[PDB]
Amino acid sequence: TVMCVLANITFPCDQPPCMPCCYEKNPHETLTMLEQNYDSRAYDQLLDAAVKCN
Amino acid sequence: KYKTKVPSPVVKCCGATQCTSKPHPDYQCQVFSGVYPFMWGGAYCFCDTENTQMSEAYVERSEECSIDHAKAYKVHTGTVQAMVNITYGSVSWRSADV
């Protein structure tokens, strides 16, 4: 599994902390986490996970 | 083909911000002074003349480089291979690669 960083928290990339929706809860925090993980080899998984909101 | 990536210019209102060489292909940074930027809100920076804009630009591969591109090759020498058909007597064609 690939690891990604949000501030000092470190988490599996495919499963960000919020899960149901990570742009409505805190839009700034999701963006800043996507910016902090720019160079990650598994950034695509994060971008799907963050944008996922049913 | 190349793509000139042009990042967003840095506009300092009452300051002089200066270039810092970055490890980038054909990287160019210039610090043009005396800029009074106008934008949809209208008056972007206060100071009439003591304004600075730092513009930077650097060349990348175009998006199409993965589809069309020229591969430069050094050739020296190689195998010579051939497909051969043989018949002999009542045996039919065999057609094997050598």
Next chain:
Amino acid sequence: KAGSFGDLQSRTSTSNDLYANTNLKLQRPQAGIVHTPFTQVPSGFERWK
């Protein structure tokens, strides 16, 4: 050279060195406009093509 062939040369299709000689010069923005004008030699790849 700047515009004949090999103006942009990369060792592989995913390399990061990306030697590129295009004579890129940044130009002064026009009065009022926040834009980043620049001048460059047209690609030698297309000239070759």
Next chain:
Amino acid sequence: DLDTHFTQYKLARPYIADCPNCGHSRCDSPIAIEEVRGDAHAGVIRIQTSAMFGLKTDGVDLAYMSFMNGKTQKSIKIDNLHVRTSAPCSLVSHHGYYILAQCPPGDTVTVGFHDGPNRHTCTVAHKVEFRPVGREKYRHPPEHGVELPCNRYTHKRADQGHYVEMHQPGLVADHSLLSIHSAKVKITVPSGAQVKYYCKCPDVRKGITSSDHTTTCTDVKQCRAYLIDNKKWVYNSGRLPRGEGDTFKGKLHVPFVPVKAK
């Protein structure tokens, strides 16, 4: 597939960027053309604009464009959305900032749209060449012939690795946030959005406020105010200001990557 990439573009907002030809003159336009890519065959081009396509301020629906009427982020139904180089082009697709269109050879590229009475148009020069594939220089793609390999822009994501760099908007300037009140000037934060004021009453006054704050001073043109919204992304455009410590990138997907087709 289509849904997830359109969902994915919801982090990106349109922006107003300087454009050379707006019709009358040169102005800041919601439909500013950032880049035209015209190195595919058979006259298919990809225009990156400053307006979102297929997005609604709340959701995705592939009949809606979104664009800034100031700081309003208003969304409309695609009224005309026309692309023309020398004769009108055929809008093959529109996704995010990008539109993919089949165009005749020309010396300009103009993209424009209608918001009720108002017409927003932007022309850049960008000479467009029709690129025949093969050993006959035909001007329009034939109805029969031979299938040869050629470079075309996809409309479906192939397994993306082509990315567009995005950043948080810097200090969007607006003077409608300044007003005259009593005898001083008033900075009104529209809603939950910070504002940086730089007020040269003769002492240099400045600060960042999350609420209304009278800033003394006398005239409105001493008190330059900048909207700080960090809730959306904008393309890392050369026509948008940035600040000193604004390095953080955003890395969104690009639709309509090049592909080899026949």
Next chain:
Amino acid sequence: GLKTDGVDLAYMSFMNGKTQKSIKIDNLHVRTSAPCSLVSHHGYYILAQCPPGDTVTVGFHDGPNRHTCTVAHKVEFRPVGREKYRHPPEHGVELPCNRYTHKR
């Protein structure tokens, strides 16, 4: 920009016979070989930015009816300076040039 009683810069006036009828500017398209950008319209005159072409067509809509007129004046694009550009650039050098004024 005229109304049968007054001025208002959204209205054209033209004769439908002997009637001298006034309408809102519906399209007012000007086209040489591609549509032109109507910089202004004042009195009998309209000022437009046009691509190079071999005809000049002006037309307008009065509801269902379309009134159009094409003349065979050839319009040449005239670069200013020592480079033959076909469309005005976004950057470059500000050089003196001849333009039609837009108010007076």
